[PDB]
């Protein structure tokens, strides 16, 4: 062990575990660069942990993520949230608490999701209706 942190990040059921150890600016997704995963549109959500604060926070740290679960959008949101958490935890235990306070202020001034995970779950399906709230059609006479 040289310099490492371990943080996660979640959404609907998608879970992303980060591995931010000391490195050379390498930022990967399951072994692939931030420049592509599957999509072409939503890349900027996971660009946000970078463009808000600049690339210089990642000069000597290398990050690995093992996202599994949920769906494409859920995985993207979980990944970017986990990246933000990992960067903050690195600044906490290694770099500077004042630095992490400035970073989390940037995040919370942009999006509370970056630090505060969304606590929403699919409400269970009830008998007498196809959905949680939707009901079978009523036929008076």
């Amino acid at each position: 062990s040289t310099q490492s942190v371990q943080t996660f990040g979640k959404k609907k059921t998608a879970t992303a575990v980060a591995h931010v150890k000391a490195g050379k600016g390498l930022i990967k997704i399951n072994g692939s660069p931030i420049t592509l995963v599957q999509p072409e549109i939503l890349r900027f959500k996971v660009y946000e942990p970078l463009t808000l604060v600049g690339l210089d926070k990642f000069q000597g740290i290398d990050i690995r993520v093992k996202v599994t679960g949920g769906g494409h959008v859920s995985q993207v949101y979980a990944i970017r949230q986990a990246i933000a958490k990992g960067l903050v935890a690195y600044h906490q235990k290694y770099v500077d608490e004042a630095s992490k306070n400035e970073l989390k202020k940037i995040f919370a001034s942009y999006d509370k999701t970056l630090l505060v995970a969304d606590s929403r779950r699919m409400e269970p399906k009830k008998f007498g209706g196809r959905g949680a709230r939707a009901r079978f059609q009523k036929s008076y006479r």
């Binding site: 490195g23 050379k24 600016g25 390498l26 930022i27 990967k28 660069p33 931030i34 420049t35 999509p39 549109i41 939503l42 900027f44 959500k45 660009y47 946000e48 970078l50 463009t51 600049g54 690339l55 210089d56 990642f58 000069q59 290398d62 959008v73 949101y77 999006d111």
Partner: protein, 199 residues
């Protein structure tokens, strides 16, 4: 001005987002203004976002929706017609092709084009039950503006080779100029034309 080359390469345009948050890194959310002050406190463009997909909690509290990007508002309003419910990636692709096609046609900023179209597509006189004609609230005028724009586009794109983003573009152009060639602007004629008789 800042060279931060790391182990993985990051493209030139993505190295243009450090100094201005931009929708698709192509439009500026710092110059567009609203013609009238009664449609300002219920719209937020002073908070640029790269994408029209945040999926915020804008239905929880009472006026939680007031703090919603106009781009997400329009994009969400395109998710209708039933078969298109819960297809938001398709809608964001449509809106980016929109912004592009408007910019190829317009000389102003398409953000400004849409903001003007929306602030000029909210009818001022509409009536409730004869119906006693009353003056509509700001947020309501806004939401019928976006709703009518998306409708007009949707029913123009039905049985038409002109694609959905193209119909959206034409509707936005016609509603931006204030001319009675847009589906919303002609409805903006009918609502007041009926409502005046109702007083």
């Amino acid at each position: 001005l800042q060279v931060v080359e790391l182990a993985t390469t990051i493209p030139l345009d993505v190295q243009e987002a450090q100094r201005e948050v931009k929708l698709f890194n192509k439009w500026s959310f710092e110059d567009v203004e609203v013609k009238d002050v009664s449609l300002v406190d219920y719209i937020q463009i002073r908070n640029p976002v790269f994408v029209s997909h945040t999926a915020g909690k804008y239905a929880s509290k009472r006026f939680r929706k007031a703090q919603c990007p106009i781009v997400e508002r329009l994009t969400n309003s395109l998710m209708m017609n039933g078969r298109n419910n819960g297809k938001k990636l398709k809608a964001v692709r449509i809106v980016k092709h929109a912004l592009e096609i408007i910019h190829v046609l317009t000389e102003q900023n398409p953000i400004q084009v849409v903001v003007d179209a929306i602030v000029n597509s909210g009818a001022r006189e509409d009536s409730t039950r004869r119906r006693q004609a009353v003056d509509v609230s700001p947020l309501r005028r806004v939401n019928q503006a976006i709703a009518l724009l998306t409708i007009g586009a949707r029913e123009a794109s039905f049985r038409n080779i002109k694609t959905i983003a193209e119909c959206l573009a034409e509707e936005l152009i016609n509603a931006a100029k204030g001319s009675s060639t847009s589906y919303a602007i002609k409805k903006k004629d009918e609502l007041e034309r009926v409502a005046k008789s109702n007083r």
